[PDB]
Amino acid sequence: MKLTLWTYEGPPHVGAMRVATAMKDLQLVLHGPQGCTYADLLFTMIERRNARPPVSFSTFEASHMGTDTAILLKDALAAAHARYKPQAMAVALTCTAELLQDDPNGISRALNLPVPVVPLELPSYSRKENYGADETFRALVRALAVPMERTPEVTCNLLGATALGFRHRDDVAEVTKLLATMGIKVNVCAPLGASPDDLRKLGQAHFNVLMYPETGESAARHLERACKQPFTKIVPIGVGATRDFLAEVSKITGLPVVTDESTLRQPWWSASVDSTYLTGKRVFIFGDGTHVIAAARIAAKEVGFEVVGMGCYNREMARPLRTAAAEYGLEALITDDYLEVEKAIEAAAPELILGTQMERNIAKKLGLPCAVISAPVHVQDFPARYAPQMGFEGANVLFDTWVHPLVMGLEEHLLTMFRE
Amino acid sequence: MKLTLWTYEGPPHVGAMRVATAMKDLQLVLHGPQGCTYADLLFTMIERRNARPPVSFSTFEASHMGTDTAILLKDALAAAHARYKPQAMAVALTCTAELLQDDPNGISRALNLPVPVVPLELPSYSRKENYGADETFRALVRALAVPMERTPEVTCNLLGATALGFRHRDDVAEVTKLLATMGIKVNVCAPLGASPDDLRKLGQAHFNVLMYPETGESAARHLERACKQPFTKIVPIGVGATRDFLAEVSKITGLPVVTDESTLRQPWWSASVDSTYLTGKRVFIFGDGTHVIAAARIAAKEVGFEVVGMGCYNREMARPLRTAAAEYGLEALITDDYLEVEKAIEAAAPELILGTQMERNIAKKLGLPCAVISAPVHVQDFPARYAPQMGFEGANVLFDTWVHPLVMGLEEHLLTMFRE
Amino acid sequence: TFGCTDSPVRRERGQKAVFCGLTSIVWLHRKMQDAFFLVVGSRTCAHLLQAAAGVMIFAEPRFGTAVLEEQDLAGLADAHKELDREVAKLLERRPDIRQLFLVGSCPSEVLKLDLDRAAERLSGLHAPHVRVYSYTGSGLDTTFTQGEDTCLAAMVPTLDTTEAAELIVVGALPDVVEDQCLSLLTQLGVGPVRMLPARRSDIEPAVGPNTRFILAQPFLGETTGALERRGAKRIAAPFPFGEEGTTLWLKAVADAYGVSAEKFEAVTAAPRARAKKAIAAHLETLTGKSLFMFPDSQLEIPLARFLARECGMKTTEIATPFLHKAIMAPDLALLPSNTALTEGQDLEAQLDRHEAINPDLTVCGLGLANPLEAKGHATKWAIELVFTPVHFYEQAGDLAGLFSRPLRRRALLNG
Amino acid sequence: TFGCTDSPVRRERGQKAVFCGLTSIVWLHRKMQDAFFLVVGSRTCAHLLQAAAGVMIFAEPRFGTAVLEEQDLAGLADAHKELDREVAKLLERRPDIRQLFLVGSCPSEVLKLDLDRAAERLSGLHAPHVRVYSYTGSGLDTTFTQGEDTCLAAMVPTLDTTEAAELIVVGALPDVVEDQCLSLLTQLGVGPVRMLPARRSDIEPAVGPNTRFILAQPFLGETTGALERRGAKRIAAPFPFGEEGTTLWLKAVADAYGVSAEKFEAVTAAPRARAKKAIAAHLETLTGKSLFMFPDSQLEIPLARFLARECGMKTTEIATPFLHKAIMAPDLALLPSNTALTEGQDLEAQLDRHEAINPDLTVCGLGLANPLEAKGHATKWAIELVFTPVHFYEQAGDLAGLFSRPLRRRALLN
C-alpha cells in the first residue's frame, strides 16, 4: 500500500488505450468494472479528439459475481466485432479483472472471430501506462509484422508515436521533413495513424527510426530479428542531438547528410548578446526518461545552463538516465513520488525548473520560473499551433518555451523592485 | 507641448530606419545630432539582427553651429558611398535637423553621386514612425519602379513587410505558402529582403498583395498608376479573412481558389466543447489599425467573444477603424495617449484585453488576462519559433495565444478559491 | 401533456459510460471541511480521481488513495497491518482531519477486503480525536453521485440521537446555495434547520423519532433509507430546480410545518419574480428545442422537468443511472408524458436510439461530447451540473444559462 | 610597463555611436527620491528614453518629456505659456515632487527657447513647495553620463552655504554601495560625510570654503568646476574599481583627513582580502586576454585600469567620450603604457582599428554588440556597468564577473 495523491503514470490499460487510439480500424476490448471507463476523457478532451476512442468494456457490476463474468467478455468481443468490423482486435484485463478468473486468451480463442484478436499481458499492480503502451505495441507488431523484400527506394518506419503523446503529432511532422531532406521517404508511421493492414507492411523498410524509446522500443527490438531492421538509438531533440541523429542515419543508409538550415534560428538566438545572462543559471530537470536526457544536453551545451538536478518518473528508463546524469557530475533521481521531486528541487536550489504539469505546480509554489518538457500534461500542451520538440523547428520552439518563463521572472523582479 | 511618458510610435526617422534596414544594398543618411543614434538598439536587440543597420549619421554637436552643418551631411553622404557602394541611397533629416537650414535635396544634388540618392520629407513634429515607413517606401518605389511587361506565369509582389515589423518574417513565409497553393509565385517581396536592383523589377507582376496598409499603401497606390497594378484590399488575418482574401485573389487572377487545409486546426479547436465557456467573454481590443480590425472579426465571429472596445494609436487608419467598429455597435477609440486606453478599458470592463506591450502592462496592473496582437512589442515577440499571424498556421497561433492567458486566469482563480 | 408516473421505465443493462462513486469524493471533500476520504484501491482508482479532480489535485485536496501493491493481493492479514500504519502516517501528517473515510473500491472488494472492521478498529486506536467510518464507492456498487449517498448513509447510524423536531436538508450543496436555502426556510418560520452533511464534524445534525428531513438531491436513496430506520420521517418534494422547483420545494416544507400561505407568498414573492425574469432571457434560444439526456447523475429527470416546463424544451429520451420510484415521484408527475425513461444503459443501443432521433441539445459525459459535436449534434456536458451552483431561485437564470449557451454558440459559429 | 600620463590621446571627431545626456535621467531619477526630470524635446527624445528605460517605463518612473509639437516651433512666447501649463498639470497631478528639472534637448536649444528663465519663473509660481532647476541633456552638449554632471552642476550654485569641513561624495551610487562607502569612511574616523546627489532634497549637502569633496565617478567635470567656484577643494584619487582602486580611494581621503596608517590598516584589512579572493575566481579566464573599449561612459579608463592590473588583461585601445586631464590623472598613472587612448571617436575609423586588432573582449554599446558577435568577437555590453553595483570592495567580484561571463559563455558554446 502506497499513499498516492498525484500519479505520473496511468495504470497499464491506459497505455493500451493509448496505442489502440493511435491506430485506425482497430478495436480494443477491456475486461473491467462499470464506472472504470473514465480514460475516454483524456483522449477526447486533452488530445481533443473528434471520434470516441476505439475502445469497449464489458462493464460488469456487483450482481455479476460467479462465472457470469467470462460470458460478459465473450459478448463484449462479439458485439465489438459485429458492430465495427475492424481489420484486427486486441483484448486485455483492467486491474479489477486481473483479480478475476476469466482468461483473455481462452475466451478469445474459443469464440474464434474472422480477424486476429491479440491478448495482452498487463500486470497492473507492478507496471504502468508506459509499459502498457510498449507491450500492447510489441504484441501488435509481434503478431502482424512479417519478413518482406525492401522497397526499391530507401524507406523507414517511425516507431513509437501514440495518442496522448506529448508533441507526437508535430514531431512526426518534423522528423518526416528532416528525413525527406536526405532523400529518405517514410514507410509506415506506427502506432500513430496506422491500421493493422499497415502493420503487415512493416518488413519492407530498410531501418526503423525509434521516436520514443518509452513507447515502442520492444517493438523496435522485435523488428531487429523479424526483418533484420536496425533502429536509430539517438533521439533528435536539440540541434546537436539532431545532427548526430542525421549522421547516425547516414551511417545506416550510406546517404550523405543534407540539412535545410534556412529556418534554424536557435543557435544565433543563444549566441546573441541578450542570451549572455543565461550563462550557468541552475536548472533542475524532471520528466519522462527520454525528454530529460534530451533537455540536459540542450541546457548545458546549447543554452549554457548549469544542469543542477536530473531525474525521471519512469523506472523503465533509469539506466539510460543514470548513465547520462553521471556525465554531468550528477546522481540521477529516479522517483514517481512528487514529494521526492519537491525535496530534490529544494536541495538543488535551481533558478529554473523543466518538468511536467506537476513541476509547473511545484515551481509555482516556490516562485521559480518553469517550462514543461514532458508528459503528463494538460490541454494547454496539446496546442492548435505547430509546436514540435524534435528537429530544427523543434529547437526553435524549445528555446522560446524555456527562455520565456525566465525573461518574465526578470521583468517581475525588476517591476516590483522599482515599485519600491 | 504634450506631456509624454509612453509613446506608441517613434519619430518618422525610425520609420525611415525601419525601411532602410529591411532592404539589402541600400544606405540611408540621417542628418541629426550626436547621441541620437539610439535606434540601432531596436534593430540589433529587439529584432535580433547580426549586422549593423545600414544607417549612417552626420553626428553634429554644439561646436558646429554656422553653415558648418551642410558640409557635414555632404561628407556623410560621401563617406557612406565610398565605404559601402550600395546600388542606391536615401537621405533625410532627423527632427533636430528639420529645424536647421541645410536641405537634403540641394546637398545630394550638388555632390552628385553615381547611384540614385532619394531625399525624404519627414515632418517629425506632425508625423510618426508609421508615416516615416510609408513615405520612405513610397519615395523608393516612386523613384525606382518602371513599367514592364508581365511575367510569363502569374506573379505578385508582397508590399509592406519591414524591419521591426510584428511577425513580418513569418507572415511573409505563411502568405507565400498560401499563394503557391493557388499556382501564384511571388515576384519581389519589398521592402523586406529586397535590394534597389529588385525595386526596378516591380512592374512585371500582375498584382500587389498589400500586406500592411500602415507601412506600404502609398507604394501600393503609386503602383496602381505606374504599372496599372491592383492591390489586394483584404488583409488575411483569421480564417474568414483569409478565405475572403483568397477569393479576392481568384477575382484578380481568374484562378480557382485552392486551399491546403490539412493543418488548419483552429475551427475545430473553437468548435470543441472546452471552448464553450469562451462564449461572449468581453474583450477590449487595441493596437495598430490593421491588427485591430482583424482581431475583432476573429474575436466575434471565429472565437465567439463579445468585442467590447475597439481602437488604435495610428491616426493614419482611423477611418478604416471607425467604419469596422460601428459594425460591432461600437465607437472606435482613436488615441495615442495610453492614459486614455486605461480609461476606456476601465469603462468597457472587459474580461480579456488584446493589445500592445503597454496593454499587457495595463492588464497586469488590473489583474486581467491579456494577449499581444500588435507592435510596439519587446524582444519576446520576435520569437525563435515559427509564429505568423496571417493565413492558416497563423490562425492556429492566434487561437493558442489568446486562449492561454484565459485558461491560466481560470487556473489561478480556481487554485486560490480552493486554498480557500 | 404533463404527467409520467405510469410511464414504463426502460430498465436497461449492457456496456456503460459512467463514473464510479469514487468521483463523488472530489466534491464532497470540499463541503466537509473536517474530513479526509482515503480510497483503498488500485492505481486505476488514483488515476481516475486525478482525471476527475483536474486542477484541484494541486490544491492539497483532502483525499487520496492507498494504492494496492502486488504484495497486498496474497496474504490479506497484511492488508489490515499495512493500512493501519498507512492511516496513522496520514493522520500524523494532517492532524486537523477528524472524520476519516475508508472508501472502498472494486479491487478492494474483489479481495473481499473487509473495510468495516478496519473502520471500527482504527476508530478505537485513534480515539477520540478522529472518528473513522467506511462506505463503498466501487464502480460495482456505485455510479457517480451514488458515492455521496453511500457515504452519508454510512455516517447516519452514528449521529447523536435526539428528541426535537427539526428539519434536516440532505445533499451537499454549494455553500452560497446552502445559505439562501437556510435563509428562506427561516423567514417561513421554520425554527432550527440543519444540513446533512455539515460543514464540520462537531456540528453534525442529531436525528430522532420526531426529526423530519427533505432531499436537496435526487440521488439519496440509502441515506433516506438509513434516516427512516432512525425513525425520522421524509418530506416529499420535487427537486429545487427552476422557479417552479424551488417554490414547490419550499411549499412542501411550508405545508408540513403549518405555515400560512400568507407568510409564504410574502416571503417567496420577491425571489420568485427575480427568477422568472432571469430565466426569461433564455426562452428565445431554448423554446421548442428537443432534449436528450444520457445517464450520469440522477439529476437528469428534475433538470429535464425544469427545462421542458420553464424553458419550453421538448423531452426526447431522459436517462438516469438509477431511478428511485418513490423519491422521483413529484418530478415525474410534472415531466411531459411523451418521454422515454431509461434506468441504466446499453451505450450502443442508446447511441443508436439517439442517432435516428437527432435531438437538438444532448446532455452527456466528456468522453461522448466531442465525438457527438464532430457529428453535428450540440452537446452540454453534464458533470458541470453537480459542482456549479444551480439549485434554488438566484441560480435559476444561470441554470437555464448552462443550456442556452451551447446552442447560442452553435448558431454564432455559422451566422 | 605601468604609466600613461604622457601618452598622446587621440583627440577624435567624426561619426558617432553614443547616447546623449538624456539617457542619464534613467538611472539617476532612482537615487533622487524627491525629483522629477522633465525633458523638453521632440518625440525622438521621448522614444529614446523609452528605449533606454526598457521595462522601467511601466513603473511610473519620475521623468517624462514635454514633446514639442508643430505649433511650438514658431514663436518663442506661446512656447512658455504652453510649458507652464504642462508643468502645472504635472505638479498638481503628483504633489510628491519637490525639485523639477527642466532638462534641455537638442530641439529646445536649437529653438533657442530659454529654459533658464523658465526654471526661474516656475520657481515663483510654484514656490516654495517646489524648487525648479534647469540643465542640458542635449546630444549637442552632452554624452551619456555627462547628463548627470550638467545636472549636478546646476544644483550646486543653489545648495545651502556652510563653514564646516565635511566630506562630499559626488556621484550617484547604488544605495547598497552608498552605504558601504559611508560605513568604511565612518569607521575610519571621518564624520560627517554627505552625498551629491542626496536621496531627498531636504537633506542636500551644504557647501563652503572649508568643504572637501571626492568623485565617486569619473564623469564630473562641470560639477567639480562648480564646487570649486564655491570654495571647495577636490581630493584626487583613482576611481574605486577593484580592491586596489577602493584602497587608494580610501587612502587618499584618509590621508587628507590625517587618519593613522594603523586605524586604516585595521578597518580596511578584512574587506580587501574578501575582495582579492572574489576576483581570484575570474583570474583564470581573464589573464592574458586583450581588451578593447569603445567610448560611452567615461568609466573606460578606470575599469580598464582595474581589468589589466587586478585581472591581468592586455589593454589595446581604450576609448572615452571625454577625457579630463586633471581628474583621470591618478588612474592614467596606473594604466599600462602599451595603451592607445581615444577621446570622442570616428565610428568607422575605430571599427577598422578594432578589426585589425581583433581583441579578445570588446566593451561596447548595444547597437554594435551583436554585429560584433556574429562577426566573431566576444563582447560585453557597456550600459550595464553604469546601473549595476560595481564600485568598492563587496562588488569587485561581480565586477570582474561582468567581464568573465561573456568569455566563459563563448568557450562553453564550442
Ligand code: SF4
Ligand atoms: S473503484 Fe472500480 S470503477 Fe473506480 S477506478 Fe477502481 S476499478 Fe475503476
Ligand code: SF4
Ligand atoms: S540626441 Fe538630441 S534630439 Fe536626439 S534624443 Fe537626445 S536630446 Fe533628443
